[PDB]
Amino acid sequence: REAQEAGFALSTNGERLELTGPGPVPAELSARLEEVTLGSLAASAELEV
Amino acid sequence: IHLAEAVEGLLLEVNRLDELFRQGSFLREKTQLEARFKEAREQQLEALR
Amino acid sequence: ALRRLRRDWALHYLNNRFEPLFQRFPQARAYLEALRARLARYAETGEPLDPAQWRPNLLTSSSSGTPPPIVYEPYATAPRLFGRLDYLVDRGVWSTN
Amino acid sequence: LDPAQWRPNLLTSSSSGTPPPIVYEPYATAPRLFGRLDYLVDRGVWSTN
Amino acid sequence: APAGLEVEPFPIQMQVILVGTPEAFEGLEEDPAFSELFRIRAEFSPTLP
C-alpha cells in the first residue's frame, strides 16, 4: 500500500523484495522495504522457535 | 545471583539490538546515509561522462 | 559510516537499560560498562558474542555468617586448594572462557 | 605493516621523582624481575611480536 | 593455554585454621613467615581432667 501510494510497484522476488517504478524510490520507502525484509526474517525465526 | 540473571537478560538483549536495527528511524537514517554515498558515486560518474 | 551509525544507536539504547543496573549495583559499574562495551562492540563491528566468556562466574555460596562458611580439604591440592582454570579441546582447537 | 610488530612497548612507570619509582618484590623470580616475552598459539602456530 | 586468562588473584578475606599433629608442625614452623601468618596456637591437650 505504501509503495502504490507513491506510484511504485512492489516486486516480491522472495525473501528479498524490490520496488519497480519511475526513478529511485524515496529513502523512507527503502527503509520500509528493509524493515519488512528484516521483520520477515525475525518472524521466521520466531515461528520456528 | 541477581548479577547472573541481569547478565542473562543483557545477553539475550542481542535480539533487542537487532530489533533496534529493525526500527523505522534507524533504517531511514541508514538509507539516507547510503543515499549521500551513492549520490557522490554517480556524481563522480557524471563528471567522468 | 554504517558501522558508526550502528555503534551510536547501540550506545544510545544501552544507557537507559544499564543505568538501573548501575543504581542497584554501583560496585559492578566497571563490568556492566565493560559488558556494555562488549555489546557496543557487537553492534559496531558486527562481531558475534560468546555468552560463556561474558557471564559472571560464582564461587562462594551466599551466607549470612550463621553458620559461617566452613570448608575443610582433607586432600589439599592446588586444583582443590586455590581452584583451577580448565580449558577445552575441540578437535585440537584450544579454547577457554 | 603489522601494528603488533611495529608498536612501542611501554615499560617505564612514569613519575615526577617525588615520590620516586618504588618497586618492591616480596616474591622474586626472573619473569617478575627482568620481565618476559610472551608468545601466541594459533591452532598450534607459534607467533611472536 | 591457547592465550591463557589474565585472572587477577582472588582476594583472601578468610581465616585459615590449620589442624594437625605436633610432628607435622615441626616441619612447618621454621619459617618466620609462618609465625607472622599464624600466631594463635590452639594446642589440644591429649588428656582431660
From TrEMBL, chain D:
The gene is lon_2. This is endopeptidase La. Transmembrane segments: none annotated. Belongs to the peptidase S16 family. It comes from Meiothermus taiwanensis. It comes from the Bacteria.
